[PDB]
Amino acid sequence: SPFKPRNYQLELALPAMKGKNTIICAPTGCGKTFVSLLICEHHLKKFPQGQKGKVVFFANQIPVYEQQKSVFSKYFERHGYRVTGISGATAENVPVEQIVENNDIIILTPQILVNNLKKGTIPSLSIFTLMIFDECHNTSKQHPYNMIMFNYLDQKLGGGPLPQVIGLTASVGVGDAKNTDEALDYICKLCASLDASVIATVKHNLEELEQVVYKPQKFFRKVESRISDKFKYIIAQLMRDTESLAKRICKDLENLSQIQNREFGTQKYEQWIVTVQKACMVFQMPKDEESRICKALFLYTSHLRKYNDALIISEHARMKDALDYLKDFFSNVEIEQDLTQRFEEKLQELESVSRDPSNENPKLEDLCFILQEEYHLNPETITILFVKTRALVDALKNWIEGNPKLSFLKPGILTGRGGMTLPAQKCILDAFKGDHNILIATSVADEGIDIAQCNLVILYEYVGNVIKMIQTRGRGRARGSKCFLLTSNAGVIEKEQINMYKEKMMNDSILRLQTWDEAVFREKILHIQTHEKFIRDSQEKENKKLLCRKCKALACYTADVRVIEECHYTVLGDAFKECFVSRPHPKPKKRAKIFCARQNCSHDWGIHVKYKTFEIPVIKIESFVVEDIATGVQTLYSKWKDFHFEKIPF
Amino acid sequence: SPFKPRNYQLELALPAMKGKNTIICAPTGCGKTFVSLLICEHHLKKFPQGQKGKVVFFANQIPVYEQQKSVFSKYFERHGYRVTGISGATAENVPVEQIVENNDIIILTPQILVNNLKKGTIPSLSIFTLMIFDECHNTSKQHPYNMIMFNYLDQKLGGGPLPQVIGLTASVGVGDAKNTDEALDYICKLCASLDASVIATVKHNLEELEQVVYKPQKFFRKVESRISDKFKYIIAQLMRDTESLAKRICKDLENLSQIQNREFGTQKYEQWIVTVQKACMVFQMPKDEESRICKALFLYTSHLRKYNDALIISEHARMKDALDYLKDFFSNVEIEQDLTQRFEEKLQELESVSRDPSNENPKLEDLCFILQEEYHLNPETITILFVKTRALVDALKNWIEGNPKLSFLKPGILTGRGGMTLPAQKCILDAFKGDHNILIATSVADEGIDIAQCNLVILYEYVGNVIKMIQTRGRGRARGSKCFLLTSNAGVIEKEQINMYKEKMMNDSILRLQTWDEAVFREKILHIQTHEKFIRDSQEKENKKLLCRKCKALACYTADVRVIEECHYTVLGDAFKECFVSRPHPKPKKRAKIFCARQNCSHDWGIHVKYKTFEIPVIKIESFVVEDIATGVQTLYSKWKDFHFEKIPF
RNA sequence: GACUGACUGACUGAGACUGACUGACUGAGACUGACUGACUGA
RNA sequence: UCAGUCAGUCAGUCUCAGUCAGUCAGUCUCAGUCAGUCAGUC
Ligand SMILES: Nc1ncnc2c1ncn2[C@@H]1O[C@H](COP(=O)(O)OP(=O)(O)O)[C@@H](O)[C@H]1O
Ligand SMILES: Nc1ncnc2c1ncn2[C@@H]1O[C@H](COP(=O)(O)OP(=O)(O)O)[C@@H](O)[C@H]1O
Ligand code: ALF
Ligand code: ALF
Ligand SMILES: [Mg+2]
Ligand SMILES: [Mg+2]
Ligand SMILES: [Zn+2]
Ligand SMILES: [Zn+2]
């Protein structure tokens, strides 16, 4: 009620009010949600007595879903329209076939609608009259939005009434253009993909926009690395030693992988290790010596990979975290005794260099400096920090809570479900309206969190396509806000600069497109839709052995595996009941795990679980190598979809 | 005699008359009791001279038992058949082994039959020839009906004659179906669980049903809450203060429980308090300071819980009740002096806001409005009001009797035994045939009270599965009746709507099932019974220390506890005779209670009681913490079944 | 013949106490599967 | 075109806690009426 509609909202609403399928392109923070409110209200009130229509509203991430549902519920309570929502949260849900019919406004996540359409419970899209697509720029190759549109267009082009389509965006996306022409082509293809005739952008009331919406400012921070790293040097020495050990047993392995000049802390090295594994555990010999060599190479490569992960975490996260991870692996888990001696040799030196604060990670130093100086300048402010990986979320949480210098900070974690839950996310969000001052977020904090007060956005080695850049920068709804990209690589800065340009070129291309005459636009859109529909339509149309990946013991055969509930795999038979051994006090204790029978091979196959009445063990294809019963060939399967056999029920 | 059989009763009776085990599904109020009368009469009269058979009739709740017994007694007096009943009421009962043999019709409560079968006094079910199951929808996981059926089926499938089985219902129940298929599966499993081949529903004489039976109408009433509550605010301020006090002593209490964002008036907060208790009184220290901290945290948490209960009662019941409860706790029952000062500080403000009628609970306001307007419209009517908890029964009784505006109302309480007694329930029921006009009832008023005149049913925040919805709505036998769900939460309304749908989907699924061909139905039923029987058959196959929960004083040892009559626990020895102290004038006076010896700890352990000749004290495991005599570990036992020891007689 | 006292038993009616069972409602955790997109490397 | 990492989205199977309401088993008590039996004074 207290919200007073501004002029530019009416301007944007106009074409949709008329009743054409439209796309709205506006800068972040202008209040496109209120525009959707007004369009929905005007469209619904238009119908005559005795006839009513439905409204559908999607969202990708759960917190966005929750806040949109709350906004709609608060706005439309007074008119008496009944709204509702569906999500993964609702358990034992009433069948949707009629919860669509009972209510007026329905909020969803597109996967639900796609599921129902594929199953067929919802007959056709004609039950609806208005479809609103938030963050509409994602309508592309296989995103669920595009599958919904595929159903829509396949229905329209062949032979019932169809609903109006409205899309909202803050950046339509440029794709991979190298010139204005390809940007124009990409935008035209996008508009065709969702059957829109009009693109609406505010121009008449621009000046009003400038003092209504404050554009955030951008900054870069390059941080150099240390020339001398004791931990890096000693771990690299361990790398050289372990590599020599691995080299000595094998006849050759320089030649096995085409990769060359492998650095130590690079992902290329990790790919090399994975390739050497997948090439060596598949290597066969004419027999116990074969298993022994396989075991030795497996252990060597596993420790190599674990140390490489420790190195990358060390160069990203703080000093202590890498040693924590390594010590946990060693303690939790012959040759392995030798390697344990090797690590325990250096442990104390590693701890000593870790507790020397002079060798602290420079990135953390500069991040402390930025937070300190900002919070000195403004005592009160709400800032968001963006990372790549949840492990880094936990690491930064601990490091922030453990710094006496940053007594100001009050942390709040935020991440996608699976793991924080839905009500926890809702509470953390609502608290910011409160005693929290900093929010550590993963990728879910894009596409609109709408915190009314945010003046600082920090990117911790977080870059990508232009869409992510714009959606990250836009989070600073509060005026005077700033964004800081912190990194230790110049190429990242270059990518950021070129992405800024790409944004500019897209913004010019859309203005060029707006000049085109109507009904030629629609004609070329129809042509593109027809061509793409033709392309898609014509686009598409035993008893083997399984053995332990580490000791090559004959685990089982696919003739004895019965799938339960189409989604779990198990095997019956006393023969399998000897080939493994459980653990007396399993590490989770929260149920007993499976392990290789021979004391030589401590390899985790699967886990126990109980179906309705029966306790049974289940295995993962990630544990075995498959071997033909006729020939001696082998492959490796990482995922049951690739494996092909006689899938048999319980 | 004056009852004239209607057509649909004969239609329903037909399959049972033939002699197959059947289920009857009919809408509420159609007179299924008379159908049972006719089936029983026809079945009993069929036998030839010199041979006779028995009839058994169950019921769950005592008032239903009483009214069914009265109905059978009045009907079958003229034929000369001898009926009788058994229940928990009969004291010094003649042994049943032959009160079954002496009479023809026997009325019971299934727990009696299960008790006798487990003990073995009744040899086998073959003594009977007809078993009638009223409210048959309860035959499920562990309900006594299902155990009786388990005996029946275990006898039948393995290797004497067996009795016919008839069941009656008004709603078979849908379980947790999400589609018609799962509803059909649930109904098939239900029919299998009680070995029925035919489901009977009236279709030919439907039109007769519509003017014979009036369907009650349904309505919803959403009530908003007050934005500003003085009592809520002040009690919340006390919450914040007490929480700060509790926080200060303990090193950490945030991290002990995974629960987050605890609201004040929620059950989640109560669970948090219970978790903090069960985690803190078990916490051990290397000694008097340990007891002091335990006492302090105990008192803080106890007052927190009591205030939270006051808050929830206040938001449910009237203003005065919460203060009544709190004052009674404080008056009945160092640090406690401090907290008493804290409460007495605010007492007068609490009373002042309580006696301001403008801040009355809105739910009570709207309930007064509904009763007023109805009784204005119709001066004479009989209405029933449904609540969750007996405490609310008393509160509503007082509040209704104390309102000058509602001079019309004449109240009648009704609740299960243990506490009103059986003859009191019978008198209250018979009075409604009289000067009473409103009945306040707990859950016992479901599954059929059969008040010939009821035109108004009110639900005070009472919702559940579809069975409860249907059985609650059906109570309005009188035509023109109505049902009103009053609530202050929208999710409750949504649950009610989805339950209405679930009823519709079940009613369609049963009609689908009726189409199936005979002897395939029975075949799949036999398959289900066999599978379930196999599943059930294979499904199943010291001197420690006890100390005071509040002061950690060494109470006793399990080596000195002797159980009497297998059901009371006591301890002998002068050592225990010092560890406690009785009270001179105990609060019940009706016998002396037990309390902790030290004046620091006023904690009630148990109560005195006299066996045939000897006065002895008995204790409750609810009073102590158990500690190993060898190690320092502790657990908490809430119920003697969990505790395992050397149970020794007197 | 009628006067006052004490005892026993049988029948009721009412209360308080202690133990186990079932069901419904929540709140929170663990496990296994499939899908999409973005980034790299070759 | 292939590989490998990362992050989001859904489907399905499980469990533990805590409150609530019903159902049974067992040990007790106080009241009031009734009918018998005795002692003592007239
Ligand atoms: N009439 C109005 N006056 C002031 N603020 C408004 C008005 N309408 C909407 N807003 C603000 O706009 C915000 C929603 O913007 P949103 O559309 O989510 O941004 P974006 O365009 O980036 O998606 C809300 O936080 C609300 O405070
Ligand atoms: N022949 C009849 N004529 C009129 N009323 C009848 C007749 N037979 C039974 N009734 C009524 O049916 C009621 C019993 O219904 P009941 O079977 O308990 O309902 P429900 O089907 O919900 O269990 C009684 O109150 C009685 O008055
Ligand atoms: F649509 Al936005 F922040 F870009 F809510
Ligand atoms: F069986 Al009913 F009211 F449902 F007596
Ligand atoms: Mg938005
Ligand atoms: Mg009935
Ligand atoms: Zn192995
Ligand atoms: Zn004590």
PDB file of all heavy atoms in Angstrom, chain B residues 4 47 59 81 91 143 163 192 231 250 339 345 355 374 397 402 444 467 567 573 577 584 605 611-612, unseen atoms left out:
ATOM      1  N   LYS B   4     -38.455 -48.539  11.432  1.00  0.00           N
ATOM      2  CA  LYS B   4     -38.797 -49.189  10.177  1.00  0.00           C
ATOM      3  C   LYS B   4     -37.562 -49.276   9.300  1.00  0.00           C
ATOM      4  O   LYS B   4     -36.990 -48.231   8.953  1.00  0.00           O
ATOM      5  CB  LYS B   4     -39.900 -48.421   9.459  1.00  0.00           C
ATOM      6  CG  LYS B   4     -40.411 -49.100   8.198  1.00  0.00           C
ATOM      7  CD  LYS B   4     -41.488 -50.125   8.514  1.00  0.00           C
ATOM      8  CE  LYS B   4     -42.059 -50.733   7.243  1.00  0.00           C
ATOM      9  NZ  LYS B   4     -40.994 -51.072   6.258  1.00  0.00           N
ATOM     10  N   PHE B  47     -29.100 -70.222  12.677  1.00  0.00           N
ATOM     11  CA  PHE B  47     -28.602 -71.493  13.180  1.00  0.00           C
ATOM     12  C   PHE B  47     -29.750 -72.451  13.504  1.00  0.00           C
ATOM     13  O   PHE B  47     -30.836 -72.023  13.903  1.00  0.00           O
ATOM     14  CB  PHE B  47     -27.749 -71.273  14.425  1.00  0.00           C
ATOM     15  CG  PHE B  47     -26.371 -70.761  14.129  1.00  0.00           C
ATOM     16  CD1 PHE B  47     -25.576 -70.253  15.141  1.00  0.00           C
ATOM     17  CD2 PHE B  47     -25.868 -70.795  12.840  1.00  0.00           C
ATOM     18  CE1 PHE B  47     -24.307 -69.783  14.871  1.00  0.00           C
ATOM     19  CE2 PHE B  47     -24.599 -70.326  12.565  1.00  0.00           C
ATOM     20  CZ  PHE B  47     -23.819 -69.819  13.583  1.00  0.00           C
ATOM     21  N   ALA B  59     -15.441 -51.279  20.582  1.00  0.00           N
ATOM     22  CA  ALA B  59     -15.534 -49.827  20.550  1.00  0.00           C
ATOM     23  C   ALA B  59     -14.283 -49.273  21.214  1.00  0.00           C
ATOM     24  O   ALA B  59     -13.722 -49.912  22.106  1.00  0.00           O
ATOM     25  CB  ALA B  59     -16.792 -49.319  21.263  1.00  0.00           C
ATOM     26  N   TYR B  81     -32.550 -63.043  23.876  1.00  0.00           N
ATOM     27  CA  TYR B  81     -31.107 -63.253  23.833  1.00  0.00           C
ATOM     28  C   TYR B  81     -30.459 -62.492  24.982  1.00  0.00           C
ATOM     29  O   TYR B  81     -30.867 -61.370  25.299  1.00  0.00           O
ATOM     30  CB  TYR B  81     -30.552 -62.795  22.490  1.00  0.00           C
ATOM     31  CG  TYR B  81     -31.003 -63.635  21.320  1.00  0.00           C
ATOM     32  CD1 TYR B  81     -31.753 -63.082  20.294  1.00  0.00           C
ATOM     33  CD2 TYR B  81     -30.682 -64.981  21.245  1.00  0.00           C
ATOM     34  CE1 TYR B  81     -32.167 -63.846  19.223  1.00  0.00           C
ATOM     35  CE2 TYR B  81     -31.090 -65.752  20.178  1.00  0.00           C
ATOM     36  CZ  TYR B  81     -31.832 -65.179  19.170  1.00  0.00           C
ATOM     37  OH  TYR B  81     -32.241 -65.947  18.106  1.00  0.00           O
ATOM     38  N   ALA B  91     -15.409 -53.886  38.299  1.00  0.00           N
ATOM     39  CA  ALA B  91     -14.429 -54.184  39.331  1.00  0.00           C
ATOM     40  C   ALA B  91     -14.714 -55.554  39.930  1.00  0.00           C
ATOM     41  O   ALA B  91     -15.876 -55.956  40.055  1.00  0.00           O
ATOM     42  CB  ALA B  91     -14.445 -53.120  40.431  1.00  0.00           C
ATOM     43  N   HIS B 143      -2.433 -50.850  16.163  1.00  0.00           N
ATOM     44  CA  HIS B 143      -3.680 -50.661  16.885  1.00  0.00           C
ATOM     45  C   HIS B 143      -4.235 -52.024  17.295  1.00  0.00           C
ATOM     46  O   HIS B 143      -4.062 -53.008  16.566  1.00  0.00           O
ATOM     47  CB  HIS B 143      -4.680 -49.904  16.010  1.00  0.00           C
ATOM     48  CG  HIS B 143      -5.726 -49.166  16.782  1.00  0.00           C
ATOM     49  ND1 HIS B 143      -6.942 -49.721  17.110  1.00  0.00           N
ATOM     50  CD2 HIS B 143      -5.734 -47.912  17.294  1.00  0.00           C
ATOM     51  CE1 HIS B 143      -7.657 -48.842  17.791  1.00  0.00           C
ATOM     52  NE2 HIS B 143      -6.946 -47.735  17.916  1.00  0.00           N
ATOM     53  N   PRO B 163     -14.379 -67.342  12.408  1.00  0.00           N
ATOM     54  CA  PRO B 163     -15.610 -66.551  12.364  1.00  0.00           C
ATOM     55  C   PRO B 163     -15.659 -65.542  11.228  1.00  0.00           C
ATOM     56  O   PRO B 163     -14.643 -65.043  10.744  1.00  0.00           O
ATOM     57  CB  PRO B 163     -15.588 -65.834  13.720  1.00  0.00           C
ATOM     58  CG  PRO B 163     -14.145 -65.629  13.988  1.00  0.00           C
ATOM     59  CD  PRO B 163     -13.425 -66.817  13.401  1.00  0.00           C
ATOM     60  N   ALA B 192      -6.989 -56.000   2.896  1.00  0.00           N
ATOM     61  CA  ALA B 192      -6.214 -57.207   3.159  1.00  0.00           C
ATOM     62  C   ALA B 192      -5.952 -57.383   4.646  1.00  0.00           C
ATOM     63  O   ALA B 192      -5.950 -58.511   5.152  1.00  0.00           O
ATOM     64  CB  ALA B 192      -4.898 -57.163   2.385  1.00  0.00           C
ATOM     65  N   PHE B 231       1.797  -7.525  27.258  1.00  0.00           N
ATOM     66  CA  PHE B 231       2.217  -8.707  28.005  1.00  0.00           C
ATOM     67  C   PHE B 231       3.294  -9.476  27.253  1.00  0.00           C
ATOM     68  O   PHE B 231       4.297  -9.903  27.839  1.00  0.00           O
ATOM     69  CB  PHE B 231       1.010  -9.601  28.282  1.00  0.00           C
ATOM     70  CG  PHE B 231       1.325 -10.817  29.105  1.00  0.00           C
ATOM     71  CD1 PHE B 231       1.483 -10.722  30.476  1.00  0.00           C
ATOM     72  CD2 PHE B 231       1.451 -12.058  28.506  1.00  0.00           C
ATOM     73  CE1 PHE B 231       1.769 -11.843  31.233  1.00  0.00           C
ATOM     74  CE2 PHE B 231       1.736 -13.180  29.257  1.00  0.00           C
ATOM     75  CZ  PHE B 231       1.895 -13.072  30.622  1.00  0.00           C
ATOM     76  N   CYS B 250      27.586 -19.738  31.994  1.00  0.00           N
ATOM     77  CA  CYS B 250      28.116 -20.800  31.153  1.00  0.00           C
ATOM     78  C   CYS B 250      29.145 -20.253  30.172  1.00  0.00           C
ATOM     79  O   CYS B 250      29.001 -19.151  29.634  1.00  0.00           O
ATOM     80  CB  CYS B 250      26.994 -21.497  30.388  1.00  0.00           C
ATOM     81  SG  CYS B 250      25.949 -20.379  29.441  1.00  0.00           S
ATOM     82  N   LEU B 339      15.258 -13.947  41.181  1.00  0.00           N
ATOM     83  CA  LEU B 339      14.229 -14.113  40.154  1.00  0.00           C
ATOM     84  C   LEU B 339      12.841 -13.771  40.687  1.00  0.00           C
ATOM     85  O   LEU B 339      12.004 -13.224  39.954  1.00  0.00           O
ATOM     86  CB  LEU B 339      14.256 -15.534  39.588  1.00  0.00           C
ATOM     87  CG  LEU B 339      15.347 -15.884  38.569  1.00  0.00           C
ATOM     88  CD1 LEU B 339      16.728 -15.987  39.191  1.00  0.00           C
ATOM     89  CD2 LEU B 339      14.994 -17.170  37.835  1.00  0.00           C
ATOM     90  N   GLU B 345       8.595  -7.454  40.500  1.00  0.00           N
ATOM     91  CA  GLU B 345       8.755  -6.121  39.930  1.00  0.00           C
ATOM     92  C   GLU B 345       7.655  -5.822  38.921  1.00  0.00           C
ATOM     93  O   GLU B 345       7.042  -4.750  38.947  1.00  0.00           O
ATOM     94  CB  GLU B 345      10.127  -6.011  39.263  1.00  0.00           C
ATOM     95  CG  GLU B 345      11.259  -5.586  40.175  1.00  0.00           C
ATOM     96  CD  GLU B 345      12.405  -4.961  39.405  1.00  0.00           C
ATOM     97  OE1 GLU B 345      12.370  -4.996  38.158  1.00  0.00           O
ATOM     98  OE2 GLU B 345      13.341  -4.438  40.045  1.00  0.00           O
ATOM     99  N   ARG B 355      -6.255  -6.538  33.062  1.00  0.00           N
ATOM    100  CA  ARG B 355      -7.596  -6.032  33.316  1.00  0.00           C
ATOM    101  C   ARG B 355      -8.025  -4.949  32.332  1.00  0.00           C
ATOM    102  O   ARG B 355      -9.106  -4.375  32.498  1.00  0.00           O
ATOM    103  CB  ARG B 355      -7.705  -5.519  34.754  1.00  0.00           C
ATOM    104  CG  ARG B 355      -7.396  -6.583  35.790  1.00  0.00           C
ATOM    105  CD  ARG B 355      -6.684  -6.020  37.004  1.00  0.00           C
ATOM    106  NE  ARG B 355      -5.820  -7.021  37.622  1.00  0.00           N
ATOM    107  CZ  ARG B 355      -6.250  -7.955  38.466  1.00  0.00           C
ATOM    108  NH1 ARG B 355      -7.533  -8.018  38.791  1.00  0.00           N
ATOM    109  NH2 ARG B 355      -5.397  -8.828  38.983  1.00  0.00           N
ATOM    110  N   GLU B 374     -25.129 -16.767  16.272  1.00  0.00           N
ATOM    111  CA  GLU B 374     -25.903 -17.989  16.075  1.00  0.00           C
ATOM    112  C   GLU B 374     -27.059 -18.083  17.057  1.00  0.00           C
ATOM    113  O   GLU B 374     -28.196 -18.370  16.665  1.00  0.00           O
ATOM    114  CB  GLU B 374     -24.999 -19.216  16.185  1.00  0.00           C
ATOM    115  CG  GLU B 374     -25.378 -20.297  15.189  1.00  0.00           C
ATOM    116  CD  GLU B 374     -25.044 -19.900  13.772  1.00  0.00           C
ATOM    117  OE1 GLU B 374     -24.219 -18.977  13.595  1.00  0.00           O
ATOM    118  OE2 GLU B 374     -25.623 -20.497  12.841  1.00  0.00           O
ATOM    119  N   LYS B 397     -14.168 -23.451  29.991  1.00  0.00           N
ATOM    120  CA  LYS B 397     -15.302 -23.577  30.899  1.00  0.00           C
ATOM    121  C   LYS B 397     -15.439 -22.333  31.768  1.00  0.00           C
ATOM    122  O   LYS B 397     -16.513 -21.720  31.838  1.00  0.00           O
ATOM    123  CB  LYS B 397     -15.132 -24.825  31.765  1.00  0.00           C
ATOM    124  CG  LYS B 397     -16.261 -25.070  32.745  1.00  0.00           C
ATOM    125  CD  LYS B 397     -17.571 -25.335  32.032  1.00  0.00           C
ATOM    126  CE  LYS B 397     -18.558 -26.024  32.959  1.00  0.00           C
ATOM    127  NZ  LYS B 397     -17.872 -26.935  33.915  1.00  0.00           N
ATOM    128  N   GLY B 402     -17.994 -17.093  32.924  1.00  0.00           N
ATOM    129  CA  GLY B 402     -17.755 -15.767  33.452  1.00  0.00           C
ATOM    130  C   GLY B 402     -18.011 -14.607  32.512  1.00  0.00           C
ATOM    131  O   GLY B 402     -17.550 -13.496  32.795  1.00  0.00           O
ATOM    132  N   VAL B 444     -12.203 -37.383  22.403  1.00  0.00           N
ATOM    133  CA  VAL B 444     -13.087 -38.529  22.581  1.00  0.00           C
ATOM    134  C   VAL B 444     -14.433 -38.335  21.902  1.00  0.00           C
ATOM    135  O   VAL B 444     -15.201 -39.295  21.779  1.00  0.00           O
ATOM    136  CB  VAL B 444     -13.308 -38.823  24.072  1.00  0.00           C
ATOM    137  CG1 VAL B 444     -11.990 -38.922  24.785  1.00  0.00           C
ATOM    138  CG2 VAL B 444     -14.162 -37.748  24.693  1.00  0.00           C
ATOM    139  N   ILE B 467      -9.322 -38.457   8.130  1.00  0.00           N
ATOM    140  CA  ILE B 467     -10.273 -39.214   8.941  1.00  0.00           C
ATOM    141  C   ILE B 467     -10.865 -38.328  10.026  1.00  0.00           C
ATOM    142  O   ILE B 467     -12.085 -38.304  10.241  1.00  0.00           O
ATOM    143  CB  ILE B 467      -9.598 -40.457   9.543  1.00  0.00           C
ATOM    144  CG1 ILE B 467      -8.889 -41.265   8.458  1.00  0.00           C
ATOM    145  CG2 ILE B 467     -10.621 -41.318  10.251  1.00  0.00           C
ATOM    146  CD1 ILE B 467      -7.896 -42.264   9.003  1.00  0.00           C
ATOM    147  N   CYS B 567       5.581 -53.508  39.734  1.00  0.00           N
ATOM    148  CA  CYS B 567       5.143 -52.241  39.163  1.00  0.00           C
ATOM    149  C   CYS B 567       5.424 -51.016  40.031  1.00  0.00           C
ATOM    150  O   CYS B 567       5.252 -49.887  39.562  1.00  0.00           O
ATOM    151  CB  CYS B 567       3.654 -52.329  38.824  1.00  0.00           C
ATOM    152  SG  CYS B 567       2.567 -52.583  40.233  1.00  0.00           S
ATOM    153  N   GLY B 573      16.718 -49.369  53.749  1.00  0.00           N
ATOM    154  CA  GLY B 573      18.011 -49.020  54.297  1.00  0.00           C
ATOM    155  C   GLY B 573      18.026 -47.642  54.921  1.00  0.00           C
ATOM    156  O   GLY B 573      17.514 -46.681  54.341  1.00  0.00           O
ATOM    157  N   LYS B 577      17.228 -43.296  54.340  1.00  0.00           N
ATOM    158  CA  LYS B 577      16.343 -42.610  55.270  1.00  0.00           C
ATOM    159  C   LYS B 577      16.922 -41.294  55.773  1.00  0.00           C
ATOM    160  O   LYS B 577      16.200 -40.525  56.416  1.00  0.00           O
ATOM    161  CB  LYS B 577      16.014 -43.533  56.443  1.00  0.00           C
ATOM    162  CG  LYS B 577      14.874 -44.494  56.138  1.00  0.00           C
ATOM    163  CD  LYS B 577      14.704 -45.543  57.218  1.00  0.00           C
ATOM    164  CE  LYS B 577      13.681 -46.589  56.802  1.00  0.00           C
ATOM    165  NZ  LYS B 577      12.354 -45.982  56.508  1.00  0.00           N
ATOM    166  N   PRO B 584       6.451 -31.437  56.528  1.00  0.00           N
ATOM    167  CA  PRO B 584       5.576 -31.559  57.704  1.00  0.00           C
ATOM    168  C   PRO B 584       4.100 -31.562  57.344  1.00  0.00           C
ATOM    169  O   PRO B 584       3.369 -32.497  57.685  1.00  0.00           O
ATOM    170  CB  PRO B 584       5.949 -30.334  58.550  1.00  0.00           C
ATOM    171  CG  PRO B 584       6.553 -29.369  57.586  1.00  0.00           C
ATOM    172  CD  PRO B 584       7.253 -30.203  56.556  1.00  0.00           C
ATOM    173  N   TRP B 605      11.545 -35.973  44.957  1.00  0.00           N
ATOM    174  CA  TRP B 605      11.936 -37.268  44.411  1.00  0.00           C
ATOM    175  C   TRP B 605      10.724 -38.159  44.158  1.00  0.00           C
ATOM    176  O   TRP B 605      10.449 -38.540  43.015  1.00  0.00           O
ATOM    177  CB  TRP B 605      12.922 -37.965  45.353  1.00  0.00           C
ATOM    178  CG  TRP B 605      14.233 -37.257  45.510  1.00  0.00           C
ATOM    179  CD1 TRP B 605      14.563 -36.023  45.030  1.00  0.00           C
ATOM    180  CD2 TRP B 605      15.396 -37.747  46.186  1.00  0.00           C
ATOM    181  NE1 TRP B 605      15.856 -35.712  45.372  1.00  0.00           N
ATOM    182  CE2 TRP B 605      16.389 -36.755  46.082  1.00  0.00           C
ATOM    183  CE3 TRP B 605      15.693 -38.929  46.872  1.00  0.00           C
ATOM    184  CZ2 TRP B 605      17.658 -36.908  46.636  1.00  0.00           C
ATOM    185  CZ3 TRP B 605      16.953 -39.077  47.422  1.00  0.00           C
ATOM    186  CH2 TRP B 605      17.919 -38.073  47.301  1.00  0.00           C
ATOM    187  N   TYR B 611       1.870 -50.241  51.292  1.00  0.00           N
ATOM    188  CA  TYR B 611       1.498 -51.596  50.944  1.00  0.00           C
ATOM    189  C   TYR B 611       0.678 -52.189  52.088  1.00  0.00           C
ATOM    190  O   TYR B 611       0.616 -51.630  53.190  1.00  0.00           O
ATOM    191  CB  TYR B 611       2.752 -52.428  50.672  1.00  0.00           C
ATOM    192  CG  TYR B 611       2.499 -53.820  50.148  1.00  0.00           C
ATOM    193  CD1 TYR B 611       1.741 -54.024  49.005  1.00  0.00           C
ATOM    194  CD2 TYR B 611       3.025 -54.931  50.793  1.00  0.00           C
ATOM    195  CE1 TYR B 611       1.512 -55.296  48.519  1.00  0.00           C
ATOM    196  CE2 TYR B 611       2.799 -56.206  50.315  1.00  0.00           C
ATOM    197  CZ  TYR B 611       2.042 -56.383  49.177  1.00  0.00           C
ATOM    198  OH  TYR B 611       1.814 -57.651  48.697  1.00  0.00           O
ATOM    199  N   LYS B 612       0.101 -53.370  51.831  1.00  0.00           N
ATOM    200  CA  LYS B 612      -0.942 -53.956  52.674  1.00  0.00           C
ATOM    201  C   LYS B 612      -0.765 -53.657  54.158  1.00  0.00           C
ATOM    202  O   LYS B 612      -1.724 -53.299  54.850  1.00  0.00           O
ATOM    203  CB  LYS B 612      -0.985 -55.469  52.444  1.00  0.00           C
TER     204      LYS B 612
END
